[PDB]
């Protein structure tokens, strides 16, 4: 979105160190545990009965990497997320019926994850930059709701 050159470089650099699939699975997994109502879309993934079951589920993991790869390709186009996420937005609304609040949930769980993975490198200003990116994505994903 609206990012100073410095904010972009910040976002872009930490990202360069993310293992997309690992984090993807973590975030998604964490979403289902912290905010369990989100599990409602995932009943066909099987056992989600305990935190261990959730985090260990290959379906959650596989779902995480797909969501995170898309987010990840999103960064390339900070200039035009609405552009970038328009179809997907159409999909989550018309076919999946995913309440755009969930996106806001993931965005924050994601931030928690980056923080836990990178520790001290995840400074207050790095967090801010990320917080704009995550609110920008969730906005872009909700724009075609109707």
């Amino acid at each position: 979105v609206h990012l100073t050159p410095e904010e972009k470089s910040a976002v872009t650099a930490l990202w360069g160190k993310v293992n997309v699939d690992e984090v993807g699975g973590e975030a998604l997994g964490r979403l289902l545990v912290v905010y369990p109502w989100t599990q409602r879309f995932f009943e066909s993934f099987g056992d989600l009965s305990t935190p261990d079951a959730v985090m260990g589920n290959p379906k959650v993991k596989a779902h995480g990497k797909k969501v995170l790869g898309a987010f990840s390709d999103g960064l390339a186009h900070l200039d035009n997320l609405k552009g970038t996420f328009a179809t997907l937005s159409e999909l989550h609304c018309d076919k999946l019926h995913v309440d755009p609040e969930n996106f806001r949930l993931l965005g924050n769980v994601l931030v928690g994850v980056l923080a836990h993975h990178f520790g001290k490198e995840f400074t207050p200003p790095v967090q801010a930059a990320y917080q704009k990116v995550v609110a920008g994505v969730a906005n872009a994903l909700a724009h075609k709701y109707h």
């Binding site: 369990p36 109502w37 599990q39 609040e101 709701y145």
Partner: protein, 141 residues
């Protein structure tokens, strides 16, 4: 917390709803889907068109629930135990939607009770719906 005056204001107001409770229920759902389109995400199985009998009958269930809420203002968690298990463990509606219905419900009352929708009455009702919402979302996690 519901003060004795809030309770009085709620009983009072709801009592004038009387028989229109179901009718008002539906109108509230309706204002809700048109105002806040994201909430439709939870009823992809309903015909949400205006006059829709599914909306109408759903409006009626909600309303009756609120009625039972009013009657049991002093022990709401018990009276609404089944609804809370439901919203939490089956429907799994995001908590943020409870606010949006609560608003559309205040809006419908306002539009139908031009005389009893006093500023004070307006605050005890919003207090009342926020507590009802609190109860229904208390077993989510």
């Amino acid at each position: 917390v519901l003060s004795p005056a809030d309770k009085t204001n709620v009983k009072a107001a709801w009592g004038k709803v009387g028989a229109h409770a179901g009718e008002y229920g539906a109108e509230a759902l309706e204002r809700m889907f048109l105002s806040f389109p994201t909430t439709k995400t939870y009823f992809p199985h309903f015909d949400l068109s205006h006059g829709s009998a599914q909306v109408k009958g759903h409006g009626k269930k909600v309303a009756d629930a609120l009625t039972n809420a009013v009657a049991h203002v002093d022990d709401m968690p018990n009276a609404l135990s089944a609804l809370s298990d439901l919203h939490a463990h089956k429907l799994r509606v995001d908590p943020v939607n409870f606010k949006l219905l609560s608003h559309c419900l205040l809006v419908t009352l306002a539009a139908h009770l031009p005389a009893e929708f006093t500023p004070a009455v307006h605050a005890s009702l919003d207090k009342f719906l926020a507590s009802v919402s609190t109860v229904l979302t208390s077993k989510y996690r």
